[PDB]
């Protein structure tokens, strides 16, 4: 595996989902970022509107998130540590990272334009195409990956021995 696969769990009914809807599902016009994100990033990675997500750290499970890495956004009702409510609606989105941008702690104010508490989430990942809504539930994707059906991490790293089982499917979705 030359790239990595991460799972990010977006809890519905929380500010996290509101932020996700804003910048991953809807996206933002490029002019909302001009003056704050360098034009190189915007040129290379905003195909029309810009799509991006942000986190408090550069790493997940101690793995650095790199451009070219893939992200499964799990969307559902968080009901316990690492568990989703499978009797409520769930969704999964698949993105591939075009670029990563670390915003300095001193430069986070613009993130509040877009996100509740945005200034906390200064490790940004950009997606050139809107992450693709998959046909499958969280429980079907977890099953294919060998996880328990209701697995719902805040941030998870999919080890290569598991990622390998689904890697060719994921590449074909994203092509
Ligand atoms: N908007």
Whole-angstrom distance between the N-terminal and C-terminal Cα of the chain? 17
Please tell me the distance from the alpha carbon of residue 82 to that of residue 84, in angstroms, as a whole number: 7
Task: Quote helix, strand, coil % in the chain, to nearest 5.
Answer: 35, 30, 35
Alpha-carbon gap, residue 157 to 42, rounded angstroms: 27
Contacts of 161 (CB under 8 A, 6+ apart): none
What's the number of domains the chain is made of? Answer: 1
* Resolution of the experimentally solved model in angstroms: 1.7
Long-range contacts of 160-168 (CB under 8 A, 24+ apart): 160/1, 163/1, 163/4, 163/5, 164/1, 166/5, 167/1, 167/5
Distance from residue 168's CA to the centre of ligand 1 (Å): 36
Is residue 25 helix, strand or coil? helix
The answer to whether residues 85 and 152 touch, using CB atoms and an 8 Å cutoff, is no
Q: Could you tell me the residue range of the domain that residue 48 belongs to?
A: 1-175
The span from the CA of 7 to the CA of 63, in Å, is 12
The SS3 assignment for 151 reads strand
Task: Specify which residues 156 forms β-bridges with.
Answer: 7
Tell me the CA–centroid distance for residue 152 and ligand 1, in Å: 29
Q: Kindly give the distance from the C-alpha atom of residue 64 to the centroid of ligand 1, in angstroms, as a whole number.
A: 31
Cα 69 to averaged position of ligand 1 atoms, centre (Å): 28
CA of 170 to the centre of ligand 1 (A): 30
What's the gap in Å between 20 CA and the centre of ligand 1? 13
- CA 31 to centroid of ligand 1, rounded, Å: 12
Technique used by the depositors: X-ray
User: 49 CA to middle of ligand 1, Å?
Assistant: 11
Q: What is the 44 CA–ligand 1 centroid distance (Å)?
A: 22
Question: Which segments of 67-155 does DSSP mark as H helices, in order?
Answer: 138-145
């Amino acid at each position: 595996m030359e790239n990595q696969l991460f799972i990010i769990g977006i809890g519905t009914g929380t500010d996290e989902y509101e932020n996700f809807e804003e910048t991953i599902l809807k996206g933002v016009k490029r002019n909302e970022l001009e003056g704050q994100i360098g034009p190189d990033i915007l040129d290379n990675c905003c195909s029309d509107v810009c799509y991006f997500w942000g986190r408090s750290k550069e790493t997940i499970y101690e793995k650095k998130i790199d451009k070219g890495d893939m992200v499964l956004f799990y969307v559902g009702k968080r009901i316990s540590r690492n568990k989703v409510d499978l009797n409520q609606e769930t969704a999964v989105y698949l993105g591939i990272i075009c670029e990563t941008v670390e915003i300095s702690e001193n430069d986070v104010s613009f993130l509040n334009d877009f996100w509740r508490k945005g200034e906390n989430f200064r490790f940004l990942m950009f997606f050139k195409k809107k992450p693709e809504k998959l046909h499958h539930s969280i429980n079907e994707i977890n099953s294919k990956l060998g996880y328990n059906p209701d697995y719902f991490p805040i941030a998870g790293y999919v080890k290569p021995e598991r990622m390998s089982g689904v890697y060719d499917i994921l590449k074909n979705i994203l092509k």
